[PDB]
Amino acid sequence: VEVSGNLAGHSAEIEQLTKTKVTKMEDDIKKLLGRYGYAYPRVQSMLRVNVDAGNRFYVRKIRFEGNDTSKDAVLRREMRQMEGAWLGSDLVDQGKERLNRLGFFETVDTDTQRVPGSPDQVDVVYKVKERNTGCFNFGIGYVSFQAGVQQDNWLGTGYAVGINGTKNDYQTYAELSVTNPYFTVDGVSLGGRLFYNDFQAYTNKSYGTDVTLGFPINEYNSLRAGLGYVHNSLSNMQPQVAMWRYLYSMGEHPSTSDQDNSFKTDDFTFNYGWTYNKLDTDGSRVNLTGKVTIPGSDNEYYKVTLDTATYVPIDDDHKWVVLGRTRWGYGDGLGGKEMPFYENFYAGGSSTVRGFQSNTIGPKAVYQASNYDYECATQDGAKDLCKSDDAVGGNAMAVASLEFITPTPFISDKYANSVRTSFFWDMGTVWDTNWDSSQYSGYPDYSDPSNIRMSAGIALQWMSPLGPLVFSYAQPFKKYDGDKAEQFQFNIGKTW
């Protein structure tokens, strides 16, 4: 191709990119040159291409229209085109996209304006419309009450604030979480929360605080970590083998079947994590988190977690894509200690293996008052060796799934842009550490991870304004220890 005209010092790149295709090439040339100050180059072609690069252009002022609510400083946070600098169109489109990413608006638009005082001067104009920053949810019923307030952008000032106050008889709790995404001018975020909780019959009282600092390391990934602690006093809980092992290893030796007992700690920890952000049925997200105790803590323990998902197209026409998900993690105590009961986790339900009941996966309870039920675990009912069906959670777990998404406008839909139907297969396992299979031999070994529960079936993926309706059906394939199944599961997020 012959290249001529008022060529820029970057004409090497014109030849490199060039050597409806001609129109596209011309637009790609204009796109290139728009990064070097040429706001309005013009290219004609016959192949011969005649490029009139034009002059270099500068932006005199950047102003916003339509924001009568939030601080001016907020919108300027995501610009890459600087005032008193040469124009680069990508620096403006990236700004628009970052604003669209944050979502602090009802509408966004952009334009480019000419300065009447000089043909080589331009302005950049952004226009926005805004919607609600968040809501206040209040409700009482015959007698319990819950209310809270949340905003993503407090009074348009840049802060995220959430207040949760729940009052009941069996349990009362509260949480306050406040974060400043811009503690410093470079976008370093800092925030934290205070909380209180409890439980009435076992009984528990707890409260604490956690403050986390985090910052970006590149365009889309970020790192966070911080410090906090929780006070947790647990009492009036039925003593059991999971609890007997946990407490006894610490020196705590409550009487057998003596439910009127207590143990409380002030546990101080360090929390951390990091996130991968591949955004888009494509893209991926990786959240790697964990926490450890500090020497000032009453208990000593560690926990590690992982939660990831990745879209992997299968067909080259994008008519078949598999979305994989993995959940994984475990923790235990330090120095001879075990993981505290209230720091232990459950697995199971429509979020884990869709064929099994909620919070069903893993080891079961093994073992004071009586009004006659569960007599073997009590002191007034019966004194015997109990083998219950009630899950106690575990110390380590892994979960995985594959979701197979195809278009279906030729089976049951016309648009396939609201609620999608997909096929999935999943698996997951939970097991204990420090399980003694020799004292309890007529019982499953609860440290064996190979007892993997798995299922497959069909799930819905809702995006519709109708709300977060979660419906799925799956059948389990494997059972090991009285596994309690539930093939059809659903709930609603009650939001959006």
Binding site: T133, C135, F136, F138, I140, Y142
Partner: protein, 152 residues
Amino acid sequence: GEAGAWARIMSGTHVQVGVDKKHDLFTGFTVTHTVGAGLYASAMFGAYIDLIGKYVWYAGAEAGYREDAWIEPQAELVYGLIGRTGVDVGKSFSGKDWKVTARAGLGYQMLMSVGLNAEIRDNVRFGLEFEKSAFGKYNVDNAVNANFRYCF
């Protein structure tokens, strides 16, 4: 929208899921696990008829007949034979910044019920339900339920 779906939890527990569509004509159906099911539809006849029938163990159906205020006598057929026979009342209010529906009714198995459904032209929304009853097949002493929503 012209069509949609919902689910509800009913207890003093039954779980309902259902779907409906707006066509005055409005129709829909439910399936309720205790598994039962039922159908309903309502339309203008400013009088209306709202026909609801289901087997969920409850078995039966209700019907009635109803211009800014109304009186709507209702009765139901109960199989195997006590149900709600009575007359509902209510009134609609509106203004440039709001709409309110006031509902109430009286009947017997003594049955009394009230409620309020109100919306503001801004982010604020209100609602209230209450039922009271005596001397029939069930007795409600207190069923106060009230809430509201606000967004910034």
